[PDB]
Design a binder for this molecule. Sequence first.
Ligand SMILES: *[C@@H]1O[C@H](CO)[C@@H](O[C@@H]2O[C@H](CO)[C@@H](O[C@@H]3O[C@H](CO[C@H]4O[C@H](CO)[C@@H](O)[C@H](O)[C@@H]4O)[C@@H](O)[C@H](O[C@H]4O[C@H](CO)[C@@H](O)[C@H](O)[C@@H]4O)[C@@H]3O)[C@H](O)[C@H]2NC(C)=O)[C@H](O)[C@H]1NC(C)=O
Ligand SMILES: *[C@@H]1O[C@H](CO)[C@@H](O[C@@H]2O[C@H](CO)[C@@H](O[C@@H]3O[C@H](CO[C@H]4O[C@H](CO)[C@@H](O)[C@H](O)[C@@H]4O)[C@@H](O)[C@H](O[C@H]4O[C@H](CO)[C@@H](O)[C@H](O)[C@@H]4O)[C@@H]3O)[C@H](O)[C@H]2NC(C)=O)[C@H](O)[C@H]1NC(C)=O
Ligand SMILES: *[C@@H]1O[C@H](CO)[C@@H](O[C@@H]2O[C@H](CO)[C@@H](O)[C@H](O)[C@H]2NC(C)=O)[C@H](O)[C@H]1NC(C)=O
Ligand SMILES: *[C@@H]1O[C@H](CO)[C@@H](O)[C@H](O)[C@H]1NC(C)=O
Ligand SMILES: *[C@@H]1O[C@H](CO)[C@@H](O)[C@H](O)[C@H]1NC(C)=O
Ligand SMILES: *[C@@H]1O[C@H](CO)[C@@H](O)[C@H](O)[C@H]1NC(C)=O
Ligand SMILES: *[C@@H]1O[C@H](CO)[C@@H](O)[C@H](O)[C@H]1NC(C)=O
Ligand SMILES: *[C@@H]1O[C@H](CO)[C@@H](O)[C@H](O)[C@H]1NC(C)=O
Ligand SMILES: *[C@@H]1O[C@H](CO)[C@@H](O)[C@H](O)[C@H]1NC(C)=O
Ligand SMILES: *[C@@H]1O[C@H](CO)[C@@H](O)[C@H](O)[C@H]1NC(C)=O
Ligand SMILES: *[C@@H]1O[C@H](CO)[C@@H](O)[C@H](O)[C@H]1NC(C)=O
Ligand SMILES: *[C@@H]1O[C@H](CO)[C@@H](O)[C@H](O)[C@H]1NC(C)=O
Ligand SMILES: *[C@@H]1O[C@H](CO)[C@@H](O)[C@H](O)[C@H]1NC(C)=O
Ligand SMILES: *[C@@H]1O[C@H](CO)[C@@H](O)[C@H](O)[C@H]1NC(C)=O
Ligand SMILES: *[C@@H]1O[C@H](CO)[C@@H](O)[C@H](O)[C@H]1NC(C)=O
Ligand SMILES: *[C@@H]1O[C@H](CO)[C@@H](O)[C@H](O)[C@H]1NC(C)=O
Ligand SMILES: *[C@@H]1O[C@H](CO)[C@@H](O)[C@H](O)[C@H]1NC(C)=O
Lengths: 125, 444, 441, 126, 121, 445
Amino acid sequence: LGFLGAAGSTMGAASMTLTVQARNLLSGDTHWGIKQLQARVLAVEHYLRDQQLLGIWGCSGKLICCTNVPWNSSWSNRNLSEIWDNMTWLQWDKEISNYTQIIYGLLEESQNQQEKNEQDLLELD
Amino acid sequence: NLWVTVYYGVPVWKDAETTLFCASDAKHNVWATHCCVPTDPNPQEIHLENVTEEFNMWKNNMVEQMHTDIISLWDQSLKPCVKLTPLCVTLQCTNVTNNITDDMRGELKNCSFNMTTELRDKKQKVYSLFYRLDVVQINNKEYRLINCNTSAITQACPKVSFEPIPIHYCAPAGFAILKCKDKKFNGTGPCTNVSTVQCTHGIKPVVSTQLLLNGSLAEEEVIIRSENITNNAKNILVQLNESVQINCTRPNNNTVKSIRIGPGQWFYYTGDIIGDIRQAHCNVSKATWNETLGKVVKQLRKHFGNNTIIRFANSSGGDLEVTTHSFNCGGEFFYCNTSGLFNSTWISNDSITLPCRIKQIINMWQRIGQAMYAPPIQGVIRCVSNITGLILTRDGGSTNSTTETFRPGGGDMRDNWRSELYKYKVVKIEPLGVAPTRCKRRVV
Amino acid sequence: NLWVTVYYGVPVWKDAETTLFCASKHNVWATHCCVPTDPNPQEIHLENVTEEFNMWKNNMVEQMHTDIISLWDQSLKPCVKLTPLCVTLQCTNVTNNITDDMRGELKNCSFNMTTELRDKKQKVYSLFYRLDVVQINNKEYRLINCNTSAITQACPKVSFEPIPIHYCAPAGFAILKCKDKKFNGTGPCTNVSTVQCTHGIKPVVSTQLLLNGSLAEEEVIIRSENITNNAKNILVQLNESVQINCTRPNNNTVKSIRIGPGQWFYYTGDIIGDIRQAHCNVSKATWNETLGKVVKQLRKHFGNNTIIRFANSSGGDLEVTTHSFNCGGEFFYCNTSGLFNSTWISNDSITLPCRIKQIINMWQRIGQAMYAPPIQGVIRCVSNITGLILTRDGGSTNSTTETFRPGGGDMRDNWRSELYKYKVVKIEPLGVAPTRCKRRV
Amino acid sequence: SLGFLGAAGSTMGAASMTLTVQARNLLSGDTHWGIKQLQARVLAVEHYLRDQQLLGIWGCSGKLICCTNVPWNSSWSNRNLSEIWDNMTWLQWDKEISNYTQIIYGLLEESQNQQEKNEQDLLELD
Amino acid sequence: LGFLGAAGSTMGAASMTLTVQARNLLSDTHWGIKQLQARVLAVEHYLRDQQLLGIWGCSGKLICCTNVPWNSSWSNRNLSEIWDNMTWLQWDKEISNYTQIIYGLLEESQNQQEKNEQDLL
Amino acid sequence: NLWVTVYYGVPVWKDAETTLFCASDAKKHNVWATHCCVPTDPNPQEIHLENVTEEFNMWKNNMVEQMHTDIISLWDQSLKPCVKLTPLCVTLQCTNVTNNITDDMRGELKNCSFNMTTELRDKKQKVYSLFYRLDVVQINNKEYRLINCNTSAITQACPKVSFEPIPIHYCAPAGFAILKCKDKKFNGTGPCTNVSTVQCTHGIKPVVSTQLLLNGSLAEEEVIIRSENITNNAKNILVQLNESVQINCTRPNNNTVKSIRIGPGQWFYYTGDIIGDIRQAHCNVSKATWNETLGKVVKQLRKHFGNNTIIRFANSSGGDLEVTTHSFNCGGEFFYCNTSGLFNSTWISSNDSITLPCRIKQIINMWQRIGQAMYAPPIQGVIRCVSNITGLILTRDGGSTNSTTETFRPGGGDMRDNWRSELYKYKVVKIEPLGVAPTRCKRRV
Ligand SMILES: *[C@@H]1O[C@H](CO)[C@@H](O[C@@H]2O[C@H](CO)[C@@H](O[C@@H]3O[C@H](CO[C@H]4O[C@H](CO)[C@@H](O)[C@H](O)[C@@H]4O)[C@@H](O)[C@H](O[C@H]4O[C@H](CO)[C@@H](O)[C@H](O)[C@@H]4O)[C@@H]3O)[C@H](O)[C@H]2NC(C)=O)[C@H](O)[C@H]1NC(C)=O
Ligand SMILES: *[C@@H]1O[C@H](CO)[C@@H](O[C@@H]2O[C@H](CO)[C@@H](O[C@@H]3O[C@H](CO[C@H]4O[C@H](CO)[C@@H](O)[C@H](O)[C@@H]4O)[C@@H](O)[C@H](O[C@H]4O[C@H](CO)[C@@H](O)[C@H](O)[C@@H]4O)[C@@H]3O)[C@H](O)[C@H]2NC(C)=O)[C@H](O)[C@H]1NC(C)=O
Ligand SMILES: *[C@@H]1O[C@H](CO)[C@@H](O[C@@H]2O[C@H](CO)[C@@H](O)[C@H](O)[C@H]2NC(C)=O)[C@H](O)[C@H]1NC(C)=O
Ligand SMILES: *[C@@H]1O[C@H](CO)[C@@H](O)[C@H](O)[C@H]1NC(C)=O
Ligand SMILES: *[C@@H]1O[C@H](CO)[C@@H](O)[C@H](O)[C@H]1NC(C)=O
Ligand SMILES: *[C@@H]1O[C@H](CO)[C@@H](O)[C@H](O)[C@H]1NC(C)=O
Ligand SMILES: *[C@@H]1O[C@H](CO)[C@@H](O)[C@H](O)[C@H]1NC(C)=O
Ligand SMILES: *[C@@H]1O[C@H](CO)[C@@H](O)[C@H](O)[C@H]1NC(C)=O
Ligand SMILES: *[C@@H]1O[C@H](CO)[C@@H](O)[C@H](O)[C@H]1NC(C)=O
Ligand SMILES: *[C@@H]1O[C@H](CO)[C@@H](O)[C@H](O)[C@H]1NC(C)=O
Ligand SMILES: *[C@@H]1O[C@H](CO)[C@@H](O)[C@H](O)[C@H]1NC(C)=O
Ligand SMILES: *[C@@H]1O[C@H](CO)[C@@H](O)[C@H](O)[C@H]1NC(C)=O
Ligand SMILES: *[C@@H]1O[C@H](CO)[C@@H](O)[C@H](O)[C@H]1NC(C)=O
Ligand SMILES: *[C@@H]1O[C@H](CO)[C@@H](O)[C@H](O)[C@H]1NC(C)=O
Ligand SMILES: *[C@@H]1O[C@H](CO)[C@@H](O)[C@H](O)[C@H]1NC(C)=O
Ligand SMILES: *[C@@H]1O[C@H](CO)[C@@H](O)[C@H](O)[C@H]1NC(C)=O
Ligand SMILES: *[C@@H]1O[C@H](CO)[C@@H](O)[C@H](O)[C@H]1NC(C)=O
């Protein structure tokens, strides 16, 4: 399908559309010219912020990444079978509201530790 | 077995506000000049399977942008044009008396004044006819133009066409336009048939005050949409599922003359008139009108009770711009009397002829401080247009008589675009998210 | 033995220039600085950091100058022009209810102005101050700027009252603060911290003496780019404020006319009651103690065996020789010679007369004249002196007696006071260092 | 954690654990005024991208800390390693050298070129 | 040697300058806008190239080997001609507008590889 | 047994339009320099490309189009803050200047008077001045108005602003490169084998003139004649000379310039009087040089027309002064010089400098646009300028009956042609870093 045809997709099914969603993110009177110029700049800023975060978390090389952060019961209490193919991703997303900063902080810290540990030992005399 | 996985490129979005740009493709038309992007929307439609969305037309920021953008284009288009400041002089006038019917007695005045010309040193005496609506007595009598005590007036440039053409609004990267596909949607429902486009439908900016012209029709039934049905002080936007054809003319054959005032600045004169003097008129089929209103009433009573009697009275007192049906017909500005359309009470072929007046000074968008002068148009004017909807208000002040009254409404023009784009929403794309996987990062 | 290793995100910076944005109802400042500031200062004190500051080279001063000029020019852009009024005036003196501290100061003028219709003229009467009117030669007069510049009426609905202004760094930049007690404006500073934005600095415009600014804290602090060089101004920051109560005592009437379609002109009309000169009241006791404190601090720069005298101002135009400020929206010019008479050898207030002027050539710029519409009623304000601009009279022959004269200068020096503590730097995330490891291959 | 540049007083070694905060604060989050603001945003982006491009070129993309295959030259600096990492901050370090920037970058560019061409030959062989 | 210097060199030889080119791709209201528009476009083109290398799994390498088989239909020219005699300009003329075909194929190979790894982890 | 190999930083490009930025050197109030505040590099680069071929087409070149667009804009922006002369167009009363003038230049000037508004709105002042007849049109007793009064507002150019052309370098934005053809003898309408890449163009002065190309690039080997279509007689022929010819032009009379205030800081300048001799403006070009130069051009034309042809020169078609004469700016004044003295002879199968008269006018419809006008303040003192002719613009009459005799005449057209000549050797391309090729490697899985 095309962009967003995955809207009704389950979390499992949705994994096969990560490339259509990703490829469509980039690009397609004084006051008019400025407004459109501003819009283009903002699109770039949003793009870069997302890339920076994936970089920081160590998942910049993939559309799908396993992290070194455990899942918390304070975030959700559902089964793997409940979530995959028995859940539509759009709803899964509303269900994780307010957990964004918690999760990001954890991703940053676990990545900080992994890089540090590798520097101390794999690079060791 | 409890871990975190992260994804990029997930099909997720949030309600969002961004700036849209226009595009249109089909001479010196302002809309055509401005909306320079080619469109050609061949791949636009993507259906979203298993999607329900919340829409709310009354909070549509796109309406606000159209209002803003339309005014901006209008003003910009009039900047490189002739200023008529030099015409704020004492004007001497007498009555036009020749070949005038009763309906037009005193309507036109024969005026003259001392105008400047190319050299500062030279003056010229000129003559013109005016509609009484544009001229005020000073107090053989002396007059001034109505705008001179408030602001300078600018003459619109004759080559420039403001004729509305379909305009498509296109999203910037990172955004999408989401559309409701529900024939019974009243503007705020949780639509269960949703699709998206990158650029929307070509909707033309037709501007009017009592009834709505050249819009879309409802697919199956008349739909009555209001932000608060209960609130009497709201415009009710009624969309018809059938159009009503209306024919409207300006029967007098106008001679247009022009005089140079400045180095390249020219002013257009009304000249004189060929043919007996008559007022302007619009014609609506009586039977069609009666069927149309009855259809509205049935739906209206579904909201207000099917044992209710509904009176459709004419407009309330107020300024011409408020009480009449105002529209642009062939470049001319008409102010028509709609009382002839609202004289029935609903309980359990000839046309309707509506007299109309013409005014050349327009305080468009009700923004006081500026005025535009509409040059006279050579010959006669005829246009045909479709009534695709209307605006009503409740009169209120009920006595629990179960007899509601709905006079015609009015207001700014935001409601006009809200009606046409009631089905569209804008969202932002959000590519990142996580899930409760059982996979841990595999590390040394 | 050692290898090159590189890092990203290294906490270092370089001196740099950039554009700071402004952040905080018909007030020009409020309108422009529509962006709110965060409620949280977010200041990080740095440990083990010394930084070098130089207030005389702080480019933030230049930015503020540019920004203020822009706002004034923008603000007057949509206002009615008064060029239709550059006509010959017929004037006589106002002689009734005169105390003679203003004899001939105000004149009664009349003129034929254009009304909204071009073919109708009207006789109008008004009262003008001598400062705005010159003789052409019941004599023929003209406004002072009708031979040099266009005159624009400031819009009656727009306030220019200064509000605190905060400047904020763009991403990639940071602002460092000095905050070193008794710092003289230059060199290494050890009380350094990092901030996102400056505090709110109110852009009060004045000459000779600075009003409603920051204090010197514990001691009076005197700063100059060069102590010896008499070409430099001396910025004296007081450690306590001095209040001054200033008024325009006459009860005025405001009248207006249409000079065009939607074009209204405002004028002084009539005066209710009798005539009194504008004036400012300064406590002498406070003032005399204040000056002594200033001298005690000046002594560390010139020697404690030197005798000091304070002189009145030098010659120049009104904007140069008198103290100037905006009070109630009116423009006051005050004679401060009475404040600088004494010598220091090793309620009892003073009243300073003031003058009122309506046509203002702002910022020492010529070609853009602003007309100040009249204010009805009586004007009163109380302002705080927080510092002075002084110069050393110069001409010294090493006589051991020195004289300091009130100075003044470009508005940049006033902003230089509150911008004293701030510096902006660019962040440089990359760096290289030696280590033990070689890249794994 | 002190936050952005709170590491200014930290030793070079200690400061390595704050590289992430410094990275986070590099991205953001009247006709003339509008232009000035656009210029500011564009330049910030250009600087960000230039640093990322170079990390790519030098083969350290995705890392905050990267070992290279370029040996250290004592002509740039000849100091005790323990003094560098434990008794100096990064700001002091930068000031200590404030040189040889182009030399180092040239060495990094080439050592990456050597590594990628060697990988290409080996992979075509197997 | 220099920016786009060895333009006439063969495709194989040309590998020696690919880095110089990469390093040189990054840096009155009407005038100011023209310049901003130019800067923005340069950024957009740059990011699109990076995005493509990302989606194909080549973002970490200047020179990338992929698993997409070569189609003799696109070109039946020999490696002995392509790397040793032809230049990149000539080659591009002979790519005969099949670039987008290859892009679609590269994208599919990458999708398969990322999914397979995730199932294996 | 092949797969796809992906490369980044690939040395390929495409023809592409983009704008260039303007740069200038370190050498006031010069309009060009004021706009082009970006300095050029002290050390320019050029890389010759070995085993390179390219194609140039000067007739389809957006570099020229940009230069035109920007030069117009700059001109107009420069006049934005200058005093408008709107109040100046009042009934003008004139008599002819005949008492001090020789029969030559007699009748060129009129002595006119008018009542103009001064600093105060209540007053007018009586002003009289000298005018060229070309700026004044009769109304009908003697009664005149300014010639462009009934077309547009006239703005006085600001007297401090210099328009003297300075070399301008156009520089590529990142992602783009400028290619140039170094072939010693080519017409730039096709393939080139000596090609190099540069960051910026050679500086080109923004000289404005018609039917004659002044202070440009000189050909090095021979006269080179180029056109878009040789057989199309409706097109201009650009002739690039390989030897320059010096032309000495003057405005010989010593005037007096006066000025008045017409408003609050508004100054108007006009010619007050003339002291001494009154003579027509003129230009002097060596005859011998001209005949040899023209002969070289003819030899070059013969290469395209035949061994037995007859090459006739004649003057241009009649029409507006602006298209008919060799217009140019000399010392800041606008000259409209005769052409016929140089185009009379037919070529068959001290130095007697030719003197041509020049007209001068102060109201100019700049850039051949209608609806705008500028007034040239009078310039105080005697004016002399000496310049180099580096090229010519001619048309062929066509309508051939194969008589073998053909006529060439001076002619003009859009001023872009002047810049096409200077830019005939440059092209702009977009750099395209990605590409693919077949390989013997596959990824490890
Ligand atoms: C609802 O929708 C309808 C249908 O589109 C609109 O009706 C149209 O209104 C426009 C504007 O008045 C009409 O266009 C004008 O037609 C004039 C007459 O043209 C005749 O001859 C041509 C052939 O040459 C026929 O195609 C045409 O049907 C007529 O028989 C022209 O003279 C007008 O020209 C104007 O502009 C030119 C420059 O472009 C000037 O030189 C002219 O002097 C003049 O100013 C113009 O083209 C159009 O014909 C109507 N369509 C139909 C089917 O009748 C309604 O107006 C719209 N309602 C609302 C409220 O918007
Ligand atoms: C092709 O190229 C030639 C270059 O030689 C051009 O001819 C030159 O034109 C310029 C512009 O008018 C001349 O420069 C002017 O010269 C005037 C004469 O003064 C002479 O003596 C002084 C003594 O120091 C010299 O510096 C000066 O160069 C002259 O030799 C000056 O009075 C002018 O200054 C005034 O005008 C300028 C305008 O920019 C102002 O900036 C100044 O403040 C001042 O008001 C000016 O310097 C130059 O002299 C000419 N060269 C020759 C032959 O002498 C041709 O014009 C050009 N072709 C075309 C198409 O024009
Ligand atoms: C342009 O073509 C010439 C050949 O005409 C190239 O010369 C080669 O030089 C290398 C050494 O650097 C030799 O090993 C080759 O054998 C030469 N080629 C031939 C056919 O003899 C020259 O390198 C080419 N220039 C560029 C930039 O590629
Ligand atoms: C919507 O639901 C149907 C089952 O009724 C399913 O086959 C289809 O794939 C779903 N749509 C999407 C985008 O997954
Ligand atoms: C989950 O979050 C709570 C806070 O609500 C915290 O106390 C707990 O330690 C967290 N557990 C894990 C496994 O992260
Ligand atoms: C986030 O917190 C709010 C608090 O009111 C809650 O309503 C909402 O459901 C939460 N979102 C989640 C847990 O997805
Ligand atoms: C608006 O809607 C509410 C709920 O239906 C109703 O109570 C209210 O009366 C409405 N507005 C007014 C002013 O009637
Ligand atoms: C409605 O009709 C009445 C009947 O005379 C009239 O007075 C009134 O003005 C009409 N509408 C308006 C504008 O009030
Ligand atoms: C008016 O006032 C001036 C003060 O400048 C004085 O010189 C003059 O004599 C006065 N004239 C009259 C009428 O007394
Ligand atoms: C107004 O104009 C008349 C013209 O007769 C003149 O006498 C009178 O003095 C003028 N009045 C003023 C105040 O200038
Ligand atoms: C200030 O400048 C003068 C010269 O103008 C010099 O003699 C003196 O030493 C300078 N003093 C300082 C504080 O640098
Ligand atoms: C002078 O002052 C008295 C007292 O307020 C007042 O009654 C009188 O009218 C004033 N005279 C004039 C000319 O204003
Ligand atoms: C960098 O090298 C230059 C070469 O002379 C030197 O002047 C400069 O001081 C060096 N940088 C520092 C500050 O160490
Ligand atoms: C491919 O063609 C070239 C040139 O004709 C030839 O040298 C080569 O042997 C052919 N096949 C291969 C790859 O050997
Ligand atoms: C010019 O004007 C004078 C008036 O003195 C007249 O004698 C002469 O003939 C006129 N010349 C022409 C050709 O207009
Ligand atoms: C233009 O060139 C073509 C050859 O490409 C030629 O056939 C044609 O006749 C030329 N046009 C004219 C008017 O000679
Ligand atoms: C005659 O024509 C030939 C080409 O056929 C040319 O090479 C030769 O130079 C010409 N000779 C003359 C005298 O024009």
